[PDB]
Amino acid sequence: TEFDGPYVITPISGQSTAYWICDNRLKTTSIEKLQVNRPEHCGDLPETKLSSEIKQIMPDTYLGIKKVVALSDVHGQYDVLLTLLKKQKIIDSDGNWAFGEGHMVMTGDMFDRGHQVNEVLWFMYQLDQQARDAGGMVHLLMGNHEQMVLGGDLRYVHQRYDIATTLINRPYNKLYGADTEIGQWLRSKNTIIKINDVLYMHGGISSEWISRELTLDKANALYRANVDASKKSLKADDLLNFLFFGNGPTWYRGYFSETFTEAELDTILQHFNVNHIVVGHTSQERVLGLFHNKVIAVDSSIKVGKSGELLLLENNRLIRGLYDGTRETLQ
């Protein structure tokens, strides 16, 4: 049988309510002053204190950040994420943020394929709040699977979540709908950000972005306002169509094409006045650089459920952080 959740409903006024799947049955609890507490007989599903701060919209451009860590495409593999962050000493063994005033960029795709999606989400919500408390930040970016799940494209959701949708009687997209805590938190997030001289997004930026004279702020605001729209309306708008489909920031795989050129990459770098672009989405066997490290791939195949790696940007170095805790300088 399954243990899964919580799924928290947070109304515009009043207390929230938590839904728990416990031994393939539903338990529902009223939340008392922001403490999300697990009912009896329900495994050790995560408990969280709700936070309003981390659902506030934050800037998408940052200056002077001394150290950054980036990783991506966890795809519901909590055990792997936790071990990697423990090995690399980003968290303490208790799982609490230990990275000080550093910034973490998770470049999308927390959802789908894996069987520990809510463990990943509540862990990242906790880390988001703890980072802020320490003067640092977690940037949870939206990947193509965040967009798919929130929008109702449920092709890649693990079978186990059929228990939650049946018992709670909501389709999976509405288990993360706008009246849910996690759905509100996600709807506050950015899709493309810039930290120092590095640009971060899930898939990559195509030359079409330039043609369309887009900006970070305009794209991130449109992503927030439309992640809820139908495919037909997305399809219908020329710019939303670009943003949400295959040549856009969350699906583009062009940097990984054997025909893509450094020349074209250089025009993108020049456009954004950056020296590097950090992307997930296209899975690699390790964190690696392309084009003389102008692109760093940080989808390290955590989705396979065995291991993963991260990128550290600190002291003007680019460092590969391995699953065993070791480090190798990329640049």
Interface of this chain with Zn ion, residues 116 to 155, rule: CB under 5 A: 143-144
Interface of this chain with Zn ion, residues 222 to 261, rule: CB under 5 A: none
Min. distance of Cβ 113 from Zn ion in angstroms? 8
The answer to whether the beta carbons of residues 114 and 73 sit under 8 Å apart is no
Q: CA neighbours within 13 Å on the CB side: how many for 311? A: 31
Min. distance of Cβ 166 from Zn ion in angstroms? 26
Whole-number Å distance between alpha carbons of 278 and 298: 7
Q: Give whichever of 139 and 281 is closer to Zn ion, judged by the CB atom.
A: 281
Find the binder of Zn ion among 103, 139, 194, 281 (CB under 5 A).
281
The answer to whether the beta carbons of residues 308 and 274 sit under 8 Å apart is no
Interface of this chain with Zn ion, residues 59 to 78, rule: CB under 5 A: 73
Q: Give whichever of 38 and 281 is closer to Zn ion, judged by the CB atom.
A: 281
Min. distance of Cβ 49 from Zn ion in angstroms? 29
- Mapped onto helix, strand or coil, the DSSP state of residue 102 is coil
Q: Give whichever of 214 and 298 is closer to Zn ion, judged by the CB atom.
A: 298
Tell whether 109 is in a known binding site: yes
Find the binder of Zn ion among 109, 119, 181, 309 (CB under 5 A).
109
Exposure letters 164-189 (e unless 16+ CB within 10 A, then b): bbebbebebbbbbbeebbbbbbbbeb
Measured from the Cβ of residue 248, the count of other Cβ atoms closer than 10 Å reads: 26
Min. distance of Cβ 298 from Zn ion in angstroms? 11
Tell whether 202 is in a known binding site: yes
Whole-number Å distance between alpha carbons of 113 and 123: 18
Q: Give whichever of 143 and 183 is closer to Zn ion, judged by the CB atom.
A: 143
- Mapped onto helix, strand or coil, the DSSP state of residue 26 is strand
Describe the strand order of the beta sheet including 103-106 as a list of residue ranges: 137-140, 103-106, 67-71, 310-314, 317-321, 327-329
Whole-number Å distance between alpha carbons of 286 and 271: 28
Min. distance of Cβ 155 from Zn ion in angstroms? 13
Q: Give whichever of 183 and 249 is closer to Zn ion, judged by the CB atom.
A: 249
Q: Determine if 113 is a binding residue for Zn ion (CB under 5 A).
A: no
Q: Give whichever of 36 and 205 is closer to Zn ion, judged by the CB atom.
A: 205
Output the six-digit token pair for 186. 């996600």
Residue 32, Cβ density class (10 Å: 0-12 exposed, 13-18 middle, ≥19 buried): exposed
Cα 140 off chain centre by: 4
Size of the site for Zn ion (CB under 5 A): 5
Listed ranges 166-174, 175-183, 277-285, 290-298: which one lies at the site for Zn ion (CB under 5 A)? 277-285
Summarize the annotated binding site as residue ranges. Answer: 73, 75, 109, 144, 202, 281
Q: Which residues bind Zn ion (CB under 5 A)?
A: 73, 109, 143-144, 281
Summarize the annotated binding site for Zn(2+) as residue ranges. Answer: 73, 75, 109, 144, 202, 281
